[PDB]
Amino acid sequence: PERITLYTAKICPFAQRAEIALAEAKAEFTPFQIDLSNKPEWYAPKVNPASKVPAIAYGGPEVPPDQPSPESVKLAESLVLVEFVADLFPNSGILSSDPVTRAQTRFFIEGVSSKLIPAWYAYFLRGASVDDLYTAAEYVQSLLPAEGFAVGKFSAADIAIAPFLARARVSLVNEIGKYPEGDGKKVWAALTSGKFARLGKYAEDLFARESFSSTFDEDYVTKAFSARFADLRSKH
Amino acid sequence: PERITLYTAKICPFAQRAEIALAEAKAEFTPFQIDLSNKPEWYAPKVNPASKVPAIAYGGPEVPPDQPSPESVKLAESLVLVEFVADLFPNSGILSSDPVTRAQTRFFIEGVSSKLIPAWYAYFLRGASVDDLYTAAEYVQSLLPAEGFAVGKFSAADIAIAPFLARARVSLVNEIGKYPEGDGKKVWAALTSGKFARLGKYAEDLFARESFSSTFDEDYVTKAFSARFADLRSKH
Ligand SMILES: *SC[C@H](NC(=O)CC[C@H](N)C(=O)O)C(=O)NCC(=O)O
Ligand SMILES: *SC[C@H](NC(=O)CC[C@H](N)C(=O)O)C(=O)NCC(=O)O
Numbered sequence: 487p488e489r490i491t492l493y494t495a496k497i498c499p500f501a502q503r504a505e506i507a508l509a510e511a512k513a514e515f516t517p518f519q520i521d522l523s524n525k526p527e528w529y530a531p532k533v534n535p536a537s538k539v540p541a542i543a544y545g546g547p548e549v550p551p552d553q554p555s556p557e558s559v560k561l562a563e564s565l566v567l568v569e570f571v572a573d574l575f576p577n578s579g580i581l582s583s584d585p586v587t588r589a590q591t592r593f594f595i596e597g598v599s600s601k602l603i604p605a606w607y608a609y610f611l612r613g614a615s616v617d618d619l620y621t622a623a624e625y626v627q628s629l630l631p632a633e634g635f636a637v638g639k640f641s642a643a644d645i646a647i648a649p650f651l652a653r654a655r656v657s658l659v660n661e662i663g664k665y666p667e668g669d670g671k672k673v674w675a676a677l678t679s680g681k682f683a684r685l686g687k688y689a690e691d692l693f694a695r696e697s698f699s700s701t702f703d704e705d706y707v708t709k710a711f712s713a714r715f716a717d718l719r720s721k722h
Numbered sequence: 723p724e725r726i727t728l729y730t731a732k733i734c735p736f737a738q739r740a741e742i743a744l745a746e747a748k749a750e751f752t753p754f755q756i757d758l759s760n761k762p763e764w765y766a767p768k769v770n771p772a773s774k775v776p777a778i779a780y781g782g783p784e785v786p787p788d789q790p791s792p793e794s795v796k797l798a799e800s801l802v803l804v805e806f807v808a809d810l811f812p813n814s815g816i817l818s819s820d821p822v823t824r825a826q827t828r829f830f831i832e833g834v835s836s837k838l839i840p841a842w843y844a845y846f847l848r849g850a851s852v853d854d855l856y857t858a859a860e861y862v863q864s865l866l867p868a869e870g871f872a873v874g875k876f877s878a879a880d881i882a883i884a885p886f887l888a889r890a891r892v893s894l895v896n897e898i899g900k901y902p903e904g905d906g907k908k909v910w911a912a913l914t915s916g917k918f919a920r921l922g923k924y925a926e927d928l929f930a931r932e933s934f935s936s937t938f939d940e941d942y943v944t945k946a947f948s949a950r951f952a953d954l955r956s957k958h
Contacts, residue, residue, distance in 0.1 A: 492929075561826075563828070565828075569828065570824070573825075585806055585810050588809055589802050592799070593797070625851055
């Protein structure tokens with residue numbers, strides 16, 4: 487493959503998807519951290535007009551990441567980037583070679599993106615009822631096989647969900663959010679035990695994956711979430 | 723590939739996506755029309771728990787589509803099915819083999835799914851401002867090359883959008899919707915001329931594609947939409 491520069495941010499779960507994929511592929515790449523509170527003026531016009539992470543500059547000459555060349559192809563959207571790494575590295579295991587398994591992989595990601603992630607942000611940012619979060623977690627849990635990862639062998643499906651389960655845990659166990667203070671620890675426990683014991687086992691296995699743990703700085707993310715969302719209950 | 727049975731509906735743009743993909747691949751398959759006004763009792767427990775079209779039953783023994791076998795693999799979600807057909811038919815052209823080109827294909831689809839389709843349904847069903855529909859259309863148009871289809875050769879990107887542009891046109895030119903009566907023909911003209919001339923040429927090219935025209939029944943869709951959505955406007 488041609489050279490890869492990844493524009494990313496430790497706080498951002500969509501960006502961690504891209505980091506996990508590159509780690510699974512053992513890809514050589516140059517990282518560049520974007521401060522989302524203080525973005526470089528060059529980032530939107532030169533790299534990503536949406537002004538978000540993650541993004542990749544692919545190819546072109548060897549340049550510093552803050553001096554991108556217009557000759558590199560600019561790419562964005564986390565789920566596009568994960569399948570891009572999978573297509574660059576066909577022996578990475580990010581996607582099965584099997585058509586049915588690939589479809590089941592993407593079907594799982596659709597459950598994550600359409601049900602679980604919106605239900606989490608509704609609960610976390612707005613204090614919506616936990617009802618939809620349980621419904622979405624039960625649905626995602628029902629797609630899991632008895633053992634292993636989303637379609638057995640680790641794949642893009644696990645990459646898609648792991649950064650969000652990790653930051654849900656960080657938020658809940660620290661009571662960060664707009665939901666009633668004190669419910670957080672109860673909800674994470676409920677999502678990982680009893681009726682949700684399979685989901686709890688799934689989360690354990692995700693968090694133990696080397697490509698996850700090597701791209702997750704739990705202390706940094708916890709501190710960044712606490713600072714950013716401290717005022718959810720108190721701001722007028 | 724193994725045997726393919728497609729559960730579909732003429733009215734449904736999501737299902738037309740799959741039909742276009744199968745036509746581009748010259749795939750052998752058995753269609754079955756799902757009565758969306760009176761869905762068969764067996765459809766949700768035996769084929770698709772979400773009770774939506776499209777769905778595919780893949781493989782297993784030869785069965786009547788109204789008696790699906792538990793041995794066939796059941797698949798759903800239109801964009802999953804389109805990539806499934808792509809993966810089954812490597813000479814179909816639905817996806818390029820080139821990693822960058824595949825990424826740009828999926829990136830176009832993300833703009834269609836996240837901006838254009840929600841803005842259309844908001845205008846049609848919710849009487850939202852036309853502003854967001856033009857904004858979303860301008861973004862999609864900005865991704866088009868100077869000539870040709872979304873990434874050059876006809877691909878999953880065009881498959882994703884064509885059924886929705888076709889039904890937006892039918893709705894607008896026949897004044898079906900919650901927007902003020904008489905605005906529709908002017909909005910479709912606006913979306914296909916002037917600042918949207920490129921998008922107008924794209925729509926013309928899409929609707930002339932054989933896989934699109936052979937899977938679109940404009941008389942049926944116009945009559946079906948007129949009956950279904952006759953009450954979006956007050957009688958007073
Ligand atoms: S997590 C930080 C934010 N990134 C995204 O939301 C990416 C979403 C895309 N759809 C994707 O890659 O999947 C971010 O960069 N926000 C910009 C800001 O100004 O906060
Ligand atoms: S167009 C007919 C409806 N299908 C869908 O909405 C499919 C959406 C999926 N996300 C997809 O395949 O992309 C439909 O079947 N409606 C029936 C119902 O009861 O909702």
